[PDB]
Amino acid sequence: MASFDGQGFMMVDNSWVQTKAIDVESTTDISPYLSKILEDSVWNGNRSIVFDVYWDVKSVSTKSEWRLCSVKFSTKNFCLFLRLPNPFCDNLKDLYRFFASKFVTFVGVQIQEDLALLKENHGIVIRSSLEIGKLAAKARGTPIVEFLGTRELAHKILWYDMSRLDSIQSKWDEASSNDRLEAAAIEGWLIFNVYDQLQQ
Amino acid sequence: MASFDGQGFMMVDNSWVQTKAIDVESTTDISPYLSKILEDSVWNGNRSIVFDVYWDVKSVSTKSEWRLCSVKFSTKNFCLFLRLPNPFCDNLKDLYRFFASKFVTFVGVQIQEDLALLKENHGIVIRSSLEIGKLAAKARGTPIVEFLGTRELAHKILWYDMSRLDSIQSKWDEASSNDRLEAAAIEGWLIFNVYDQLQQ
Amino acid sequence: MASFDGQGFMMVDNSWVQTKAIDVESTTDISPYLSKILEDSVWNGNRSIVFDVYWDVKSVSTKSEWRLCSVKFSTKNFCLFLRLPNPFCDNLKDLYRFFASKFVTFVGVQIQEDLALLKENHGIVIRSSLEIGKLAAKARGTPIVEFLGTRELAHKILWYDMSRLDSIQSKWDEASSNDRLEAAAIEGWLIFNVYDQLQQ
Amino acid sequence: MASFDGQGFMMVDNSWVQTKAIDVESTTDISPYLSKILEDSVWNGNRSIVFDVYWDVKSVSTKSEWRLCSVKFSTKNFCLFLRLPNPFCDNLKDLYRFFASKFVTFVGVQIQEDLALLKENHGIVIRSSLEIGKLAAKARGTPIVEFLGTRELAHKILWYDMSRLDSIQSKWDEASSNDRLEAAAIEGWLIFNVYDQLQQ
Amino acid sequence: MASFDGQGFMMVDNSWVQTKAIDVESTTDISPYLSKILEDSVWNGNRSIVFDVYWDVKSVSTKSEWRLCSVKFSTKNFCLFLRLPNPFCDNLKDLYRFFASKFVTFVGVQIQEDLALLKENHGIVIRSSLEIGKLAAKARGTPIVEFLGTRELAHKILWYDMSRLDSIQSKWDEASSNDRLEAAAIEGWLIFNVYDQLQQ
Amino acid sequence: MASFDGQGFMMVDNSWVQTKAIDVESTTDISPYLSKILEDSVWNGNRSIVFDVYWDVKSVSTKSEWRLCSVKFSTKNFCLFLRLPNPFCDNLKDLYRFFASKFVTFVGVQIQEDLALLKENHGIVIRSSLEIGKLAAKARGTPIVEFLGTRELAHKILWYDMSRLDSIQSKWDEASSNDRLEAAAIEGWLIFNVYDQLQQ
């Protein structure tokens, strides 16, 4: 299959996240990596995929223009990181089709504005999504969690140690590429566990 | 009246689902098949028709264009699969009229975005629809049910065996067309039983 | 007054419903027939008028165009059927005035999309409508009733026999124009009774 | 002052409604009549004015065009009826300014669509309005009344006799100008009393 | 600092309200007067400022154009009345900046439509507003309070004497400009006390 | 790291707040200063960053144009003030990226209109915001708190002394730039504490 041969990281409960970052381009086939994510979601994930999307902004002095520059998919064992070109290449069809799948649910934190931007700027549609803060808010009856970011939401639901995460993110500008990737992988693993808890 | 002479499939409760997949051309008359679906819905389904819709995306490097390419209708005994052409032939107004029928209720999983895409891109309108996860959530007082995909919703409400489905969907990239049909038919049958349960 | 000289039908409680279908033309005066409907609604219907609208779709291979092709008005004792020309003739402003009336409440099943299409395509405005399912769902406290079509809703609220209706609709394509008229007459009658039971 | 010298009518509790119908035109000064309405609203009406608006529709074969053709203002002792020209004349400024007053509350029945049409087609804005069915729905906790027209709403709240009203409106097409006016005056008086009850 | 040397008025609780009405010209500096209002709001009003806005409508025979012509600001001790020119002079950005202040909360009666008109026609924006009837309704559990005008709301919550107000407003067409100011000042004082009551 | 070498201020609980105001230019690097804010937010602020935005309006005699002229970021220990040029310089995409961050939650008072103006005029998007009043209103069950400005909200939740703040703001026009900076610093500090008390 497709190997997630990038730098891995150990979480605070000893479990491991395998990573792969791909600079997608006209000739890159990401179907095997997406295939892996889905497989892991079906077997070991209760059909969830935690995701985040990252924007680049240009031409702010004129009329600011937002473009999706990368997306993260995290399952139980994997964290896939796709850096997207500008503009998209047609093979990214696969990504559009993936995001629209109902085989799974795309779990994210504060994603209201993202879903809008994805539609407006790229026509990317996510038919099966869950803004997990809203679900936590209802299920736990504690209204604050609707408004927390990834870390603080995870802290109110899981109370795991987040020392390493907090460390990397407090000095974000100085963090190496490997460090940035690690934080992303932790955030992924954290939200995966917030969902695991809310689904049972 | 009309013959569902494609590959049939056996569900985990030993009931048989008959199938038919059609490539709608300008000279194809789908009216006999919709009649069979309607007739089965009326006598054996409490006037529900399970549906899903499938999209192809084109031209994402410039301005993506979504387009409806297949629809699936399921009742207790039948699964109908229509593959649609680009563009539509004029005789597909039969399908438009069918979707707008108040004789039945079109039941689907996570269809909010679909309904929107059907209007914007085709002016297909569904006057009688039910997004089943919403109803289930409200009736069973378990909020998470609203944000689940087909399989995971079906699991929380029926607890039937889904090994076969999971097996097919986990390795979707390498599944035969016959396998994919089976998955679709199973999902149809599952959603139907979900509805059967919430309607009494 | 005007005469409902068309085919009458007996309901399952042995009460008679008179009908009239009209092919509205520029020379046709529908005012006596609306008058009769209105009159019956005031004396015998608690000022309810049950309605349904029917659409024709054209030009689906291109840019679909929806047009109101007929409307049905049902009271306790009458069912009026109006087939409408394309385009409307200018005397159809009598229908516009009627729909906008506050003398009555127009009762329909699953009419959200209908009201919208009536605005976009014709500027038909209904100032006093009731989506009967939404009201029943609230009153009876059975949330599913909001999403049922005409027959299935009537069943959960009335439990009258509906074998005749089911029989005609299950083989709709093979139903004579007289049979189809009867089915419409019955749905009207059924919905009138659902309203009757909820207004008291 | 301005005299309400038109045909008056006795209600079923013996009280009297004085009327005036005015065909407003470029040279008509309606300020004294509006002044009267406001006076009566301040003294004897708890600062309410019941209103209704009447539309004419044109050019239905083409693109239907709605224009406000008349408006009714009812207080405790008065029913003012203004027939508006096409187009408005500039002196109707006074009416725009009146409708925007916060000295009072404009009470009406099913006015959601009207407020939209008034804004879209004339830029008429009503800053202090009350759709009285919604208020009755809350206060009385009986959800049906949100959807009733003028008469049936009045019947559920007041249980006065409405024989004469029902009579006129069942044979609306045959009713003399005086008859039509009378119904309007009763509806006014009825809603005034529905409000009187809900305000104490 | 700035002198409110217009006609003062005595409220029914024997407290004195000082007034000032200004015709804002391009060389008028309203900043001293807004400062006084702010200062009084800060020390004696719990940072509330009562406001109303007044509209002139033009050109209704063709396409009506609404335009803001006066605003009133009230605190416990002061009532400021600004008559605005057509068009605005550039120095009215002071007023724009004042309305956008988060130092205070702009309290008004039935202001939903006003806020909309202020944006559409002037891009005046009020970041900190309170539609007081909404708050009152929610806090006192009496739904009707939301739909009341200034006087009638003030009556249901304070039960002060309003003979003077009622006297002036009932014969508004023949009230001196001094009388009209008094009415405005009184209304300001009433709404302020309404807020004083709901804020503790 | 970067130095907050501007005028520091003591709060009413004897804790020090360091400040820095910057006149952002094309050559100015704000990244160290945002880094410091972020760092303090992670270690000492439960990942909250308190913010306020300030607008300049132009061309009011014509068609008003709103432009973001400065923004304030407050944590437990720092207050950062950024005055922004017109137009923005292209390196301000660092501010865009920062506002869009999910590492933190941006906490503000009455920010509905702000978020909207930030979108219409600049495409500034805040993916993780909290309107603190709306949260407090829900938690404390005191509905008025949703509509209060910064000081009055802080008063109902904290009851700290605010004489210094009130003193500066009551004579705002006569306040030195140093005084105005202090007021902004305090509001930040106050809101931080309101958040602190609601997150625990």
Numbering used by the authors:
A (entry chain A), B (entry chain B), C (entry chain C), D (entry chain A), E (entry chain B), F (entry chain C): 1 to 200
Give excerpts from the publication.
RICE1 is a novel RISC-bound cofactor in Arabidopsis. RICE1 and RICE2 function as 3’-to-5’ exoribonucleases that specifically degraded ss RNAs. We also determined the crystal structure of RICE1 and observed that it formed a homohexameric ring with the active sites uniquely embedded at the interface between monomers. We propose that RICE1 and RICE2 act to clear 5’ uridylated fragments from RISC cleavage and to facilitate RISC recycling.
To elucidate the catalytic mechanism of RICE1, we have determined the crystal structure of RICE1 at 2.9 Å resolution. RICE1 crystallizes in space group I4122 with three molecules in the asymmetric unit. RICE1 molecules form two donut-shaped hexamers that interact with each other in a face-to-face manner in the crystal lattice. RICE1 exhibits an α/β fold with a central seven-stranded β-sheet sandwiched between eight α-helices. Structural analysis of RICE1 using the DALI server revealed that RICE1 exhibits structural homology to the DnaQ family of 3’-to-5’ exonucleases including WRN-exo (r.m.s.d 2.4 Å to 2E61) and recently reported RICE2 (r.m.s.d 0.7 ~ 1.2 Å). A comparison of RICE1 with WRN-exo and other members of the DnaQ family revealed that the DEDD motif is not conserved in the active site of RICE1. Instead, the glutamate and the last aspartate residues in the DEDD motif are replaced by Tyr54 and Glu187. Notably, no obvious electron density corresponding to the active site Mg2+ ion of the DnaQ-like nucleases was observed near the active site of RICE1, despite the inclusion of 5 mM of MgSO4 in the protein sample for crystallization. Asp52 and Asp114, two residues that otherwise bind to divalent cations, interact with Lys102 and Arg127 of a neighboring RICE1 molecule. Moreover, the active site of RICE1, unlike other DnaQ family members, is located at the interface between RICE1 subunits within the hexameric ring.
